[PDB]
Amino acid sequence: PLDKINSFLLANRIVDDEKTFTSAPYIVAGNAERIVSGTGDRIYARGKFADGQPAYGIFRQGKVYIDPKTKEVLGINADDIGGGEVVATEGDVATLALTRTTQEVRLGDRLFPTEERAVNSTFMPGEPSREVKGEIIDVPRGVTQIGQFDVVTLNRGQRDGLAEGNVLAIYKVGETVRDRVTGESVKIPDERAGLLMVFRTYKKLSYALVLMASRPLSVTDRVQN
Amino acid sequence: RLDELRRIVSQLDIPVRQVMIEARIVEANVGYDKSLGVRWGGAYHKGNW
C-alpha cells in the first residue's frame, strides 16, 4: 500500500492557484550556468521572492475548463523542482540551488512560493461515495486511455462532490451508431475496471491518482460510482 | 535434500520486479541574429560605398 502511495507522491506536483502567480510570476533566468534544469545548480530569478521566501515551487500552467456557462479554468500548477533554496543578489535577482523532481525548469519559467502539503498513506483504503459523479479532463500526460494509474484532474461540479466523496469507479462512454437503421450514434457508458484515489485541494479541482484495472479510458470520460 | 531444495524453490519462485523507466530529452534552441547593411551609392559623381 505504501508503495502505491509513494508512486502518487512521486506524481504529486500539481497545485492550485495558477491565477495568483499568473498575476505575479517570479521570473527565472540565467546563462551563467545555462540550464533548463539542475540538481543543486544555480539559476537566477527576479521578484520579491528573492527577498522573501527562500524555497519555492516551480509550476507550469495548465487550465481545467469546467462549468462552460461559467467558462472557468481552474489551472494546474505542475511543480517542476522538488525544492530549491536561495541566495540574494542585488537587482532583486536571486541565485538558487535546485533539488530537482523529474521536471525540467525552463530557463524562462514562472516561479511561485513554496507551499508544503502533508500527504499520508492513510488514503490507501479508499473513501468511496457513489453520489459524486463527473467527467475527467486535463491530464499532464495528455494521452487518452492512460492506464494502470495516472494523475487526473476531476471536474468542478465533480470537484464539489469530491469534497464530499473521495473514491469512484471508471466509466468510458462509447458512441454506438445505428449504421444500418438511422446512422444515429448513441453514447453508452461502459463501466471500466479500476478506481480513482482522490486527494482534493479545495478552491481547485481534485488531483487523483487513478489505478486503472486494465480499462484504457479517454482523457474525457465519466468518473462515477 | 528434498526439503532443502523445496526451500530453494520457494526463494527462486519470486516475482521479477518490473520498473517503469522514464528518460526524457529536452532540447532548447534560442537564436538571435541581426544584420545591418548600410549602402551609399552615387554614380553621378562616382562616389559609391
UniProtKB/Swiss-Prot annotation, chain B:
Subcellular location(s): the record lists:
Cell outer membrane
Q: Which domain of life is it from?
A: Bacteria
> What is the protein's known function?
Essential for the formation of pili. Involved in the biogenesis of type 4 fimbriae probably by serving as a 'porthole' allowing passage of the fimbrae through the outer membrane.
Similarity comment: Belongs to the bacterial secretin family. PilQ subfamily.
Name of the molecule in the record: Fimbrial assembly protein PilQ
Tell me the organism.
Pseudomonas aeruginosa (strain ATCC 15692 / DSM 22644 / CIP 104116 / JCM 14847 / LMG 12228 / 1C / PRS 101 / PAO1)
Q: Which residues of the full protein are shown?
A: 432 to 480 of 714
